[PDB]
Design an enzyme around this catalytic site. Structure first.
Site, PDB file in Angstrom:
ATOM      1  N   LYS A  18       0.737  -1.374  -0.016  1.00 25.82           N
ATOM      2  CA  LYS A  18       0.003  -0.222  -0.005  1.00 25.82           C
ATOM      3  C   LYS A  18       0.724   1.473  -0.067  1.00 25.82           C
ATOM      4  O   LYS A  18       0.477   2.198  -0.569  1.00 25.82           O
ATOM      5  CB  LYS A  18      -0.953  -0.026   1.320  1.00 25.82           C
ATOM      6  CG  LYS A  18      -1.960  -0.803   0.934  1.00 25.82           C
ATOM      7  CD  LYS A  18      -2.736  -1.684   2.111  1.00 25.82           C
ATOM      8  CE  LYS A  18      -3.370  -0.599   2.896  1.00 25.82           C
ATOM      9  NZ  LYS A  18      -2.760  -0.683   4.604  1.00 25.82           N
ATOM     10  N   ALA A  88       9.753 -14.909   2.743  1.00 23.73           N
ATOM     11  CA  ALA A  88       8.956 -16.089   2.825  1.00 23.73           C
ATOM     12  C   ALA A  88       8.705 -16.273   1.309  1.00 23.73           C
ATOM     13  O   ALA A  88       8.043 -15.662   0.624  1.00 23.73           O
ATOM     14  CB  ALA A  88       7.793 -15.585   3.474  1.00 23.73           C
ATOM     15  N   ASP A 131      -5.153  -9.181  14.429  1.00 24.17           N
ATOM     16  CA  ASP A 131      -5.396  -8.837  12.991  1.00 24.17           C
ATOM     17  C   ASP A 131      -5.339 -10.044  12.521  1.00 24.17           C
ATOM     18  O   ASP A 131      -4.578  -9.972  11.398  1.00 24.17           O
ATOM     19  CB  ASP A 131      -4.794  -7.831  12.580  1.00 24.17           C
ATOM     20  CG  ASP A 131      -5.305  -7.324  11.220  1.00 24.17           C
ATOM     21  OD1 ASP A 131      -6.632  -7.519  10.850  1.00 24.17           O
ATOM     22  OD2 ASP A 131      -4.579  -6.678  10.412  1.00 24.17           O
ATOM     23  N   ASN A 136      -2.301 -11.714   6.378  1.00 23.70           N
ATOM     24  CA  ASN A 136      -1.058 -11.632   7.300  1.00 23.70           C
ATOM     25  C   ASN A 136      -0.541 -12.862   7.623  1.00 23.70           C
ATOM     26  O   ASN A 136       0.377 -12.900   8.575  1.00 23.70           O
ATOM     27  CB  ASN A 136      -1.765 -10.854   8.548  1.00 23.70           C
ATOM     28  CG  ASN A 136      -2.324  -9.428   8.418  1.00 23.70           C
ATOM     29  OD1 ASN A 136      -1.856  -8.961   7.432  1.00 23.70           O
ATOM     30  ND2 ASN A 136      -3.161  -8.908   9.244  1.00 23.70           N
TER      31      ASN A 136
HETATM   32  N1  ACP Z   1       8.597 -11.205   3.699  1.00 23.13           N
HETATM   33  C1  ACP Z   1       8.058 -11.375   2.718  1.00 23.13           C
HETATM   34  N2  ACP Z   1       8.506 -12.568   1.936  1.00 23.13           N
HETATM   35  C2  ACP Z   1       8.002 -12.793   0.794  1.00 23.13           C
HETATM   36  N3  ACP Z   1       7.292 -11.794   0.078  1.00 23.13           N
HETATM   37  C3  ACP Z   1       6.591 -10.696   0.924  1.00 23.13           C
HETATM   38  C4  ACP Z   1       7.341 -10.571   2.232  1.00 23.13           C
HETATM   39  N4  ACP Z   1       6.409  -9.317   2.705  1.00 23.13           N
HETATM   40  C5  ACP Z   1       5.379  -8.988   1.731  1.00 23.13           C
HETATM   41  N5  ACP Z   1       5.581  -9.893   0.562  1.00 23.13           N
HETATM   42  C6  ACP Z   1       5.134  -9.645  -0.672  1.00 23.13           C
HETATM   43  O1  ACP Z   1       4.886  -8.472  -1.132  1.00 23.13           O
HETATM   44  C7  ACP Z   1       3.396  -8.149  -0.999  1.00 23.13           C
HETATM   45  C8  ACP Z   1       3.250  -6.788  -0.374  1.00 23.13           C
HETATM   46  O2  ACP Z   1       3.492  -6.886   1.215  1.00 23.13           O
HETATM   47  P1  ACP Z   1       3.167  -5.674   2.068  1.00 23.13           P
HETATM   48  O3  ACP Z   1       3.374  -6.076   3.568  1.00 23.13           O
HETATM   49  O4  ACP Z   1       4.044  -4.317   1.391  1.00 23.13           O
HETATM   50  O5  ACP Z   1       1.602  -5.722   1.660  1.00 23.13           O
HETATM   51  P2  ACP Z   1       0.553  -4.601   2.380  1.00 23.13           P
HETATM   52  O6  ACP Z   1       1.376  -2.957   2.437  1.00 23.13           O
HETATM   53  O7  ACP Z   1      -0.861  -4.593   1.700  1.00 23.13           O
HETATM   54  C9  ACP Z   1       0.297  -4.824   4.057  1.00 23.13           C
HETATM   55  P3  ACP Z   1       0.476  -3.589   5.106  1.00 23.13           P
HETATM   56  O8  ACP Z   1      -0.999  -2.806   4.882  1.00 23.13           O
HETATM   57  O9  ACP Z   1       0.380  -4.238   6.464  1.00 23.13           O
HETATM   58  O10 ACP Z   1       1.565  -2.475   4.726  1.00 23.13           O
HETATM   59  C10 ACP Z   1       2.634  -9.295  -0.044  1.00 23.13           C
HETATM   60  O11 ACP Z   1       1.196  -9.225  -0.434  1.00 23.13           O
HETATM   61  C11 ACP Z   1       3.465 -10.459  -0.657  1.00 23.13           C
HETATM   62  O12 ACP Z   1       3.113 -10.754  -1.952  1.00 23.13           O
END
Ligand code: ACP
Ligand code: MG
Lengths: 265, 88
Positions: A18, A88, A131, A136
């Site tokens: 985001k 991951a 959450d 998550n």
């Molecule tokens: N530690 C990890 N290892 C591998 N892929 C990851 C990762 N962390 C995030 N990703 C990948 O990157 C994408 C975006 O992650 P991100 O945490 O930026 O999502 P987001 O911003 O929608 C959740 P938030 O609202 O908590 O910031 C995830 O959907 C996943 O595909």
């Protein structure tokens, strides 16, 4: 320690977040692969969410468990915040559920066991996630669950716990009804999760958040006929209106359905 | 600001919820220190994780002036102590 952008080789982007992007990255000294999540201050400040980020860093840095995503550290610069995270490689459980549409009992039970261990570890430090949901959860190289996104988590002694937070379909009744909450809200959300894993959609799903609130508050939900007896029992024990009636995580780990279906280490 | 929430003859519950930090500057842990205002043994200490906003100090001697000081240790910073005196 201290950290700066110079300590990492940066690879390809792993996903679009985001407020930024996540990159594959490697720590030069060790040569250790990990992920580096980059957040733009401009976008954080616009969305109002910096307090959630503080919370995520301050709590999650301290959590070391096989089923919790490591937050090794962070740093920042004039425009960006960086979180140094465990990589991951198998992605989110959310994407796995989109692909498969539902999980079988073995996969479900095994993940509930992993998540329960991790939350046991949280609750002993008197930390509550608040959450739990498929977005998550991430997956290690052996397909093992990793809970992440501690933005909405809380240390219980350090908070009054009267404000509602989390994600619509996963919110416990207590928070909707305005009462003081505790570690049992994780127990409720675990049950919603187990249901969604088995059925492919959450139990209180509805066209507006109002109906969804009412339905949670009244614990108005039904199971399809395919859901077995044992799954039904486990979920029904987790999804009790009265938090104090929900089991301990120990009892979840010992439930006979869990015993019968969880994979061996 | 630092505040004493509750006290017994041997223990104080303290709270630093009032203390504020700089934007993007996150706290690793707190160093908590306490001893008898002015008159000497070694001031004692311990640390709690940065996500704590309160802590209990136990095994204090009754009818004693204490000075309680808290140092917020950022990952990238040291905040200047906040402190308070209290008499068991
Ligand atoms: N530690 C990890 N290892 C591998 N892929 C990851 C990762 N962390 C995030 N990703 C990948 O990157 C994408 C975006 O992650 P991100 O945490 O930026 O999502 P987001 O911003 O929608 C959740 P938030 O609202 O908590 O910031 C995830 O959907 C996943 O595909
Ligand atoms: Mg997050």
């Amino acid at each position: 320690r201290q950290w700066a952008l110079e300590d990492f080789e940066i690879g390809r982007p792993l996903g679009k977040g985001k407020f930024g992007n996540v990159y594959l990255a490697r720590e030069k000294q060790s040569k250790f692969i990990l992920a580096l999540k980059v957040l733009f201050k401009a976008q954080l400040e616009k969305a109002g969410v910096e307090h959630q980020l503080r919370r995520e860093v301050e709590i999650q840095s301290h959590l070391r468990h096989p089923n919790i995503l490591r937050l090794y550290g962070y740093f920042h610069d004039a425009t960006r915040v960086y979180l140094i995270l465990e990589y991951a490689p198998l992605g989110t459980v959310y994407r796995e559920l989109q692909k498969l549409s539902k999980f079988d009992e073995q996969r479900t039970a095994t993940y509930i066991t992993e998540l329960a261990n991790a939350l046991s570890y949280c609750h002993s430090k008197r930390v509550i996630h608040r959450d739990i949901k498929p977005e998550n959860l991430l997956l290690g190289s052996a397909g093992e669950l990793k809970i992440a996104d501690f933005g909405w988590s809380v240390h219980a002694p350090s908070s009054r716990r009267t404000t509602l937070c989390g994600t619509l379909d996963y919110l416990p009744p207590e928070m909707i009804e305005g009462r003081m909450h505790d570690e049992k809200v994780d127990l409720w959300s675990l049950g919603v999760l187990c249901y969604e894993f088995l059925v492919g959609k959450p139990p209180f799903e509805a066209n507006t958040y109002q109906e969804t609130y009412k339905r949670i508050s009244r614990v108005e939900f039904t199971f399809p006929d395919f859901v077995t007896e044992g799954a039904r029992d486990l979920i029904s024990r987790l999804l009790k209106h009265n938090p104090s009636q929900r089991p301990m995580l120990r009892e979840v780990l010992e439930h006979p359905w869990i015993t019968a279906n969880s994979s061996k280490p | 600001k630092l505040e004493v929430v509750a006290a017994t003859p041997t223990s104080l519950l303290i709270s630093w919820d009032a203390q504020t930090y700089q934007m993007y500057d996150y706290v690793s842990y707190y160093r908590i220190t306490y001893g008898e205002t002015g008159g000497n043994s070694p001031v004692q200490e311990f640390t709690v994780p940065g996500y704590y906003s309160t802590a209990t100090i136990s095994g204090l001697k009754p009818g004693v002036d204490y000075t309680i000081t808290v140092y917020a240790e950022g990952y990238y910073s040291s905040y200047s102590p906040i402190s308070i005196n209290y008499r068991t």
